[PDB]
Enzyme design. Sequence first.
Site, PDB file in Angstrom:
ATOM      1  N   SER A 171       0.764  -1.249   0.000  1.00 19.79           N
ATOM      2  CA  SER A 171       0.000   0.000   0.000  1.00 19.79           C
ATOM      3  C   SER A 171       0.798   1.305   0.000  1.00 19.79           C
ATOM      4  O   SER A 171       0.262   2.352  -0.375  1.00 19.79           O
ATOM      5  CB  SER A 171      -0.988   0.004   1.170  1.00 19.79           C
ATOM      6  OG  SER A 171      -2.023  -0.942   0.951  1.00 19.79           O
TER       7      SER A 171
ATOM      8  N   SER B  55      -6.652   2.991   2.864  1.00 18.96           N
ATOM      9  CA  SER B  55      -5.942   2.130   1.929  1.00 18.96           C
ATOM     10  C   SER B  55      -6.921   1.275   1.124  1.00 18.96           C
ATOM     11  O   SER B  55      -6.914   0.046   1.213  1.00 18.96           O
ATOM     12  CB  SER B  55      -4.955   1.241   2.697  1.00 18.96           C
ATOM     13  OG  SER B  55      -4.009   0.652   1.823  1.00 18.96           O
TER      14      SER B  55
ATOM     15  N   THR C 116       0.948   3.352   5.694  1.00 20.57           N
ATOM     16  CA  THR C 116       1.243   1.986   6.103  1.00 20.57           C
ATOM     17  C   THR C 116       1.246   1.060   4.890  1.00 20.57           C
ATOM     18  O   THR C 116       0.773   1.425   3.809  1.00 20.57           O
ATOM     19  CB  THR C 116       0.191   1.455   7.099  1.00 20.57           C
ATOM     20  OG1 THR C 116      -1.117   1.630   6.542  1.00 20.57           O
ATOM     21  CG2 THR C 116       0.271   2.195   8.424  1.00 20.57           C
TER      22      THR C 116
ATOM     23  N   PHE D  92       1.273  -3.481   3.926  1.00 18.78           N
ATOM     24  CA  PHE D  92       1.241  -4.869   4.381  1.00 18.78           C
ATOM     25  C   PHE D  92       0.879  -5.780   3.208  1.00 18.78           C
ATOM     26  O   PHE D  92      -0.212  -5.678   2.645  1.00 18.78           O
ATOM     27  CB  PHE D  92       0.218  -5.032   5.509  1.00 18.78           C
ATOM     28  CG  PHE D  92       0.072  -6.447   6.002  1.00 18.78           C
ATOM     29  CD1 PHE D  92       1.188  -7.187   6.381  1.00 18.78           C
ATOM     30  CD2 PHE D  92      -1.187  -7.034   6.102  1.00 18.78           C
ATOM     31  CE1 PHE D  92       1.054  -8.496   6.855  1.00 18.78           C
ATOM     32  CE2 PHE D  92      -1.334  -8.340   6.575  1.00 18.78           C
ATOM     33  CZ  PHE D  92      -0.211  -9.072   6.952  1.00 18.78           C
TER      34      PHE D  92
ATOM     35  N   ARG E 127       4.695  -2.415  13.233  1.00 16.91           N
ATOM     36  CA  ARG E 127       5.173  -1.514  12.192  1.00 16.91           C
ATOM     37  C   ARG E 127       5.109  -0.064  12.657  1.00 16.91           C
ATOM     38  O   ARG E 127       5.786   0.805  12.107  1.00 16.91           O
ATOM     39  CB  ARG E 127       4.361  -1.686  10.909  1.00 16.91           C
ATOM     40  CG  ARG E 127       2.916  -1.264  11.024  1.00 16.91           C
ATOM     41  CD  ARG E 127       2.188  -1.547   9.732  1.00 16.91           C
ATOM     42  NE  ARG E 127       0.761  -1.298   9.855  1.00 16.91           N
ATOM     43  CZ  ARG E 127      -0.121  -1.541   8.895  1.00 16.91           C
ATOM     44  NH1 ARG E 127       0.285  -2.041   7.736  1.00 16.91           N
ATOM     45  NH2 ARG E 127      -1.407  -1.286   9.093  1.00 16.91           N
TER      46      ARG E 127
END
Lengths: 246, 245
Positions: free
Chosen positions: B49, B97, B188, B190, B232
């Site tokens: 993302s 996201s 962020t 993932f 994170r």
Amino acid sequence: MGSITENTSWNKEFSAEAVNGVFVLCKSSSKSCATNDLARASKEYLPASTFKIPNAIIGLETGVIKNEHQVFKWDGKPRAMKQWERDLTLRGAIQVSAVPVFQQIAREVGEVRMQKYLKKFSYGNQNISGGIDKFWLEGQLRISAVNQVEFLESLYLNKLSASKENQLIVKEALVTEAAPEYLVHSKTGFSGVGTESNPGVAWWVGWVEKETEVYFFAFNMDIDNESKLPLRKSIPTKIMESEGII
Amino acid sequence: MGSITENTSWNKEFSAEAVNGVFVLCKSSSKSCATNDLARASKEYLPASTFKIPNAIIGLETGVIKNEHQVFKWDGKPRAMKQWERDLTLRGAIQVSAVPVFQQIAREVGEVRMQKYLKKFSYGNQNISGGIDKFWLEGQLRISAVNQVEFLESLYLNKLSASKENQLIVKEALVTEAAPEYLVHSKTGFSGVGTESNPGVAWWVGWVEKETEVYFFAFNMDIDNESKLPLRKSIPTKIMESEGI
């Protein structure tokens, strides 16, 4: 402006605090606005520090403020408030309402250029007389809550007579609350406690972007005691969260 | 990329959680960065993302994204997540996201223009093969933590090969924390739990403007258990706090 409707029930939050003031709230998705007091919504008052919004744009437009990264250095001399005795970024100066930083910006912009831009911005009575570094603090400049929302909507849409680039720079500097789907841009103002029978004015203006909806707001109130300052935010907040804009 | 110094003491947070990852922190003031692992700092991983940043800019630059006020209407068709099942503004799509929203944008941008801008941005290995709308999700695109930081610094300074307006639009859409003298821009990432002996990757990149100082950061870690994601943010936060930020 579009249509505005008076909603006297909003006075509930004012009565509870015995405050004389006005709140104007517009939902972009309808071009309609509401207010607790139609008469005061159109009344003009000293903008106080809410003037840092147009002042910042004008500073950028005229080149006085070199760019978004300019750092305003403290010369070390005593300043009216401790929070101003330090180097500040454009956003920092705006966020802590560092008057001296903007007084110097206003001096550099100058009377001629300042007048030119307030005319372009249709900013209140456009009266800057009395001293280039204090007209918005104690001069003859006046602007109404309705004029503030019109001005803020223009800024939001990048429609002011200034580069989109500069309007965007000032916009990020005004962000005061940020969540995934909730963004707030705002600026406070406080002229002082006024004088006998002539109360000062306190402001809170800005807009809220909740999901796909946008709400423009302007609030001002008579004030003669600093202890009442928190109300400039609490009343508007109670009115908006009673409208679902929690 | 100015100068970078390895600081093994930072591994504390990593070892304390049995996590393999890297964190790069740069202080604009003194063109210098620090990292717990110099080698991994330059290793490239799937951006996931975090790629929405370059994508949003490109979507605006090419016109796919009309302007900063464009709304992304949901067609009604179910989506991987409930949070994406709704209309979204450009910032909203980035903040939550919304993968589907950007997959559509990528398609419209076109592999040709997409390849063109990633070359202008010097974005990682610039390998968008596999699927024009899934290369950053499971294609061959790779980027390091150092590269993320230099890309973000360019964005902060409006130095990317795009209009200053579009860069500014994306910058405000990245704001995640706002205070009078503290402003945070971040994103962020993932890729997932990944496969055995081939874990996924979690990211957290952005910069922090504290008073008149500016810090650029990029963090990534291998991950096979979705329960470790919080790390994170917690690990970088702890390291930055140990520095004064």
